[PDB]
Amino acid sequence: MGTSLTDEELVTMSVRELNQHLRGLSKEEIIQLKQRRRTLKNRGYAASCRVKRVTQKEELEKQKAELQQEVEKLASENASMKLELDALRSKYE
Amino acid sequence: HMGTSLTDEELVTMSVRELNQHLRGLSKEEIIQLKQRRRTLKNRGYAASCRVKRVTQKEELEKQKAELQQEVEKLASENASMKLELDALRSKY
DNA sequence: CTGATGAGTCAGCAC
DNA sequence: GTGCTGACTCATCAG
Ligand SMILES: [Mg+2]
């Protein structure tokens, strides 16, 4: 067990490992402490959520880039399959 | 004691001059709470607009890769026009 | 001050 | 219990 645990601790340990440093604490101290855990936990979930949110937009911007890369040479490749196909028709005379 | 009680919608939509009339009578402390509640309410909106703007800009990114996946297609098919213009006019030179 | 936005808290849903 | 995310509050910054 030990004494009072810090944030970087309560949130890291397992659920049973908590019932351990939990022995001997009024009915309220029992919940209120598991609460401070959940709260600390949510705080972290929020942090992933913020990141995720960004890294997902990152991906669209990345695809977007590339899926414009192709439709750039596909507009120029087809511009060339018309410039030389036009000289294979004028040669016809 | 004293005070006349408004509603969120009212207080937020209310205008600066209306607000100032609704102030007459209100104890100083009462003014403070009121002005703060208004701000909190205002932030609520800013936050809402903010959430929106995120959605807005996210669809917009897709509804743009939606114009690049459908544009790499109107050009992948204009790429089918080459089979006829490089096989039917290139067996003549 | 007004508007915007990261961080954190909270409820509510999903597994 | 765990993880996630919408809505909200708060601090804090540009304009
Ligand atoms: Mg709250």
Domains of chain A, residue spans: 2-93
Q: Closest chain A residue to B85 measured between Cα atoms?
A: A85
Side-chain-side CA neighbours of B65 within 13 Å: the count stands at: 16
- Greatest alpha-carbon pair distance for chain A in Å reads 103
Nearest nucleotide relative to A14: CA against C1': D1
Close Cβ partners of B3 (under 8 Å, ≥ 6 residues apart):
B26, B27, B30
Residue from B54, B70, B64, B59 nearest A63 by CA: B64
**Rounded Cα gap, residues B45 and B48, in angstroms:** 5
Say how many C-beta atoms besides its own lie within 10 A of residue A10's C-beta: 19
CATH class of B1-93: mainly alpha
Measured distance CA(B20)–CA(B12) in Å, rounded: 13
CA distance B2 to B23: 12
Task: Copy the structure tokens of residue B77.
Answer: 């098919």
Q: What angle do CA A32, A34, A40 make, to 5 degrees?
A: 100
CATH of A2-93, one of 1.10.510.10, 3.40.50.970, 1.20.5.170, 1.20.140.10: 1.20.5.170
Please work out, in degrees rounded to the nearest 5, the angle formed at the alpha carbon of residue B1 by the alpha carbons of B11 and B39: 20
Restricting to A residues 1-40, those with a Cβ less than 8 Å away from any Cβ of B are none
DSSP conformation class of B39:
H
* Distance, CA of B93 to CA of B79 (rounded, Å): 22
* A-B contacts at Cβ under 8 angstroms: 51
CA dihedral of residues A14, A15, A18, A20 (deg, nearest 10): -100
CA distances, B21 to each of A82, B7, B14, B26 (Å): 74, 16, 11, 10
Determination approach: X-ray
